[PDB]
Amino acid sequence: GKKMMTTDGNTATAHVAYAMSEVAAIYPITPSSTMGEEADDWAAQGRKNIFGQTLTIREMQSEAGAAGAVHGALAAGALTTTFTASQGLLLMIPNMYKISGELLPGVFHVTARAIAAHALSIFGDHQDIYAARQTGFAMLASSSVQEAHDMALVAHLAAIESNVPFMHFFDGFRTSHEIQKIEVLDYADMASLVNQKALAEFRAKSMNPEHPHVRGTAQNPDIYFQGREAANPYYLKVPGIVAEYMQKVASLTGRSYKLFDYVGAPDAERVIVSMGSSCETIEEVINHLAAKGEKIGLIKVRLYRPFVSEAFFAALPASAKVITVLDRTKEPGAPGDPLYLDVCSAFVERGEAMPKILAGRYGLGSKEFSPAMVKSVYDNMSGAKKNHFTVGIEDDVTGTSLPVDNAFADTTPKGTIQCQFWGLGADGTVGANKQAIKIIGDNTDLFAQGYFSYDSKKSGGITISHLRFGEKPIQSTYLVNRADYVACHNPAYVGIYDILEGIKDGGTFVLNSPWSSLEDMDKHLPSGIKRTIANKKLKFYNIDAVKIATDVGLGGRINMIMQTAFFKLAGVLPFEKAVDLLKKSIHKAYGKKGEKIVKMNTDAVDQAVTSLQEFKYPDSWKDAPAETKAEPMTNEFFKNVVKPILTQQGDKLPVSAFEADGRFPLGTSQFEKRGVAINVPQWVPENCIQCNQCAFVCPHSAILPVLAKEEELVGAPANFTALEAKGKELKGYKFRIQINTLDCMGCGNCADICPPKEKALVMQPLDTQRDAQVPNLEYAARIPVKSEVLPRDSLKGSQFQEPLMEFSGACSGCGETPYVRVITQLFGERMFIANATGCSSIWGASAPSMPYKTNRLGQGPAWGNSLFEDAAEYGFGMNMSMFARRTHLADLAAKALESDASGDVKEALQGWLAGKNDPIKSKEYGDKLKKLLAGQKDGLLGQIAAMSDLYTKKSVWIFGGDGWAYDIGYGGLDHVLASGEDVNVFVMDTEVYSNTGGQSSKATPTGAVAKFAAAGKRTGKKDLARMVMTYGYVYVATVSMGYSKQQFLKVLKEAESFPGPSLVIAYATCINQGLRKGMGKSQDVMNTAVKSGYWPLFRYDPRLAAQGKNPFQLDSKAPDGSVEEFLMAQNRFAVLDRSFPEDAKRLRAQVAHELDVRFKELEHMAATNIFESFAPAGGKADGSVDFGEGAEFCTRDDTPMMARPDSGEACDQNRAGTSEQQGDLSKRTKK
What amino acid positions are annotated as catalytic residues?
A: 30, 63, 113, 995
**Which residue in the set 95, 701, 990, 1088 belongs to the binding site for Mg ion (CB under 5 A)?**
990
* Extended strands (E) in 306-366: 322-327, 356-362
The count of other CB atoms within 10 Å of the CB of residue 1185 is 7
Cα separation, 68 vs 748, in Å, equals 46
| Per-position DSSP letters for 155-192, written without gaps between them | HHHHHHHH---EEEEEETTTTTT-EEEEE---HHHHHT
Q: How many residues does the chain have?
A: 1231
Residue 344 assigned ligand-binding role:
no
- 1071 makes contact with ligand SF4 (CB under 6 A): yes
Q: Is 324 annotated as a binding residue?
A: no
Stretch that binds Mg ion, among 4-12, 457-465, 810-818, 957-965 (CB under 5 A): 957-965
**Alpha-carbon span 549 to 605, nearest angstrom:** 10
Query: Phi and psi for 111 in degrees, rounded to 5?
Result: -95, 100
**Cβ distance to a copy of itself smaller for residue 416 or 1038:** 1038
Q: Would you count residue 543 as binding ligand TPP (CB under 6 A)?
A: no
Binding partner of 1058, given Mg ion, ligand TPP, Ca ion, none, CB within 5-8 angstroms per partner class: Ca ion
Of residues 656 and 887, the one with the C-beta less far from Ca ion: 887
Q: Lay out the site mask for a copy of itself across 1146-1165 (x = CB under 8 A, - = otherwise).
A: xxx-xx-xx--xx-xx--x-
Q: Which of 219, 517, 640, 902 binds a copy of itself (CB under 8 A)?
A: 219
Contact with Mg ion (CB under 5 A) among 9, 681, 813, 961? 961
Give the residue, chosen from 124, 681, 848, 1096, that forms a contact with ligand SF4 under the rule CB under 6 A. 681
Q: What gap in Å lies between CA 464 and CA 730, rounded to an integer?
A: 51
791 touches which of Mg ion, ligand SF4, Ca ion, none (CB within 5 to 8 A by kind)? none
Q: How far is the CB of 669 from ligand TPP (least distance, A)?
A: 19
Q: Is 231 exposed, middle or buried (0-12, 13-18, 19+ CB in 10 A)?
A: middle
Using CB under 6 A as the binding rule, the residues of this chain from 771 to 810 that contact ligand SF4 are 810
Q: 950-981 as b/e, with b when 16 or more CB fall inside 10 Å?
A: bbbbbbbbbbbbbbbbbbbbbbbbbebbeebb
> What string of DSSP letters covers 25-60?
EE---TTTHHHHHHHHHHHHHT---TTS---EEEE-
Give the one residue of 995, 1000, 1004, 1038 binding ligand TPP; rule: CB under 6 A.
995
167: which strand partners? 108, 139
Partner in contact with 692, chosen from a copy of itself, ligand SF4, Ca ion, none, beta carbon below 5 to 8 Å by kind: ligand SF4
Q: How many CA atoms lie within 13 A of 754 on its CB side?
A: 27
Name the one range near ligand SF4 by CB under 6 A: 812-820, 929-937, 1015-1023, 1099-1107.
Answer: 812-820
Stretch that binds Mg ion, among 430-438, 557-565, 616-624, 963-971 (CB under 5 A): 963-971
If binding is defined by CB under 6 A, does position 836 make contact with ligand SF4? Answer: no
Nearer Cβ to Mg ion (609/842):
842
Q: Going edge to edge, which strands form the sheet with 166-171?
A: 56-59, 23-26, 80-84, 107-112, 166-171, 138-142, 303-305
Helix (H, G, I), strand (E, B) or coil at 781: coil
Provide the mask over 993-1022, with x wherever binding to a copy of itself is found by CB under 8 A and - wherever it is not. Answer: xxxxxxxx-x--xxxxxxxx-xxx-xxxxx
- C-alpha–C-alpha distance, residues 816 and 116, integer Å: 24
Footprint on residues 1196-1225 left by ligand SF4 (CB under 6 A): 1197
Using the rule CB under 6 A, which residue among 993, 1031, 1048, 1058 binds ligand TPP? 993
Find out whether 1194 is annotated in a ligand binding site. Answer: no
Is 961 annotated in some ligand binding site? yes
Asked whether position 1062 contacts Ca ion by CB under 5 A, the answer is: yes
> Out of ligand TPP, ligand SF4, a copy of itself, none, which partner does residue 986 contact, by CB within 5 to 8 A per kind?
a copy of itself
Calculate the dihedral angle through the C-alpha atoms of 482, 487, 489, 491, rounding to the nearest 10 degrees. Answer: 90
Residue 199 binding a copy of itself, by CB under 8 A: no
Which pairing describes strands 303-305 and 138-142: parallel, antiparallel, or unpaired? antiparallel
Q: What are phi and psi of 639, to 5 degrees?
A: -85, -40
Site membership for a copy of itself, residue 830 (CB under 8 A): yes
Among 673, 691, 693, smallest CA distance to 744 is for 673
Q: Choose among ligand TPP, a copy of itself, Mg ion, none what residue 1018 binds, the Cβ cut-off being 5 to 8 Å by kind.
A: a copy of itself
Helix ranges (DSSP H) in 504-650: 518-524, 527-535, 545-551, 559-569, 575-588, 594-611, 643-646
982 is in an annotated binding site: yes
- List C-alpha distances in Å: 1194 to 50, 601, 1184, 1222: 59, 85, 20, 16
- For position 1098 contacting a copy of itself by CB under 8 A, the verdict is no
* Residue 845 sits in the site that holds a copy of itself (CB under 8 A): yes
Among 17, 115, 548, 697, binds ligand SF4 (CB under 6 A): 697
First and final C-alpha spacing in the chain: 94
Q: Does 91 bind ligand SF4 (CB under 6 A)?
A: no
- Residue 77 CB, shortest distance to Ca ion, in Å, is 21
Q: Which stretch binds Mg ion (CB under 5 A): 168-176, 299-307, 990-998, 1007-1015?
A: 990-998
Alpha carbon distance 1097, 932 (integer Å):
47
- 8 A C-beta contact, residue 1130 and residue 1074: yes
The 964-983 contact track toward ligand TPP, x by CB under 6 A, reads x-------------------
- Chain-centre distance of CA 506, in angstroms? 40
Q: Are 1093 and 1077 in contact (CB under 8 A)?
A: no
Pattern 251-270, a copy of itself, x by CB under 8 A? --------------------
Q: Where are the beta strands (DSSP E) in 936-1061?
A: 955-961, 984-989, 1035-1039
Return d(Cα 982, Cα 976) in angstroms, integer: 10
Candidates 990, 995, 999, 994; CA nearest to 1017 is: 999
When computed from its CA atoms, the radius of gyration of the chain, rounded to whole angstroms, is 34
C-beta of 1024: minimal distance to ligand TPP in Å? 12
Q: Which stretch binds a copy of itself (CB under 8 A): 370-378, 578-586, 610-618, 879-887?
A: 879-887
Rounded CA gap, 315 and 1208, in Å? 62
**Counting contacts by CB under 5 A, is residue 994 touching Mg ion?**
yes
From the list 1102, 1096, 1023, the residue with the least C-alpha distance to 1061 is: 1102
61 binding a copy of itself? (CB under 8 A)? yes
* Closest CB 538 distance from a copy of itself, rounded Å: 27
Residue closest to Mg ion when measured from CB atoms? 961
Residue type present at position 282: I
Residue 1062's binding partner among ligand SF4, a copy of itself, Ca ion, none (Cβ under 5 to 8 angstroms by kind) is: Ca ion
Nearest to 392 by CA among 23, 723, 654, 735: 654
Helical spans, DSSP H, in 382-512: 429-441
Of 953-1012, which residues contact Ca ion (CB under 5 A)? 982
Contact pattern for ligand SF4 over residues 1169 through 1198, marking x by CB under 6 A = ----------------------------x-
Q: Is 385 left (phi over 0), alpha (psi -120 to 50) or beta?
A: left
Q: Is 475 an interacting residue with respect to ligand TPP (CB under 6 A)?
A: no
The 807-836 contact track toward ligand TPP, x by CB under 6 A, reads: -----------------------------x
Spatial CB neighbours of 482, under 8 Å, sequence gap ≥ 6: 410, 412, 418, 502, 503, 504
User: Is 960 a binder of ligand TPP (CB under 6 A)?
Assistant: yes
The annotated binding site is made up of 30, 63, 113, 426-430, 458, 559, 601, 688, 691, 694, 698, 744, 747, 750, 754, 811, 814, 816, 839, 961-964, 982, 984, 990-995, 1055, 1058, 1060, 1062, 1070
Which residues make up the interface to ligand SF4 (CB under 6 A)? 458, 680-681, 683, 688-694, 697-700, 702-703, 737, 739, 744-750, 754-756, 760-761, 810-811, 813-814, 816, 839, 843, 990, 994-995, 1070-1072, 1197
The annotated binding site for pyruvate is made up of 30, 113
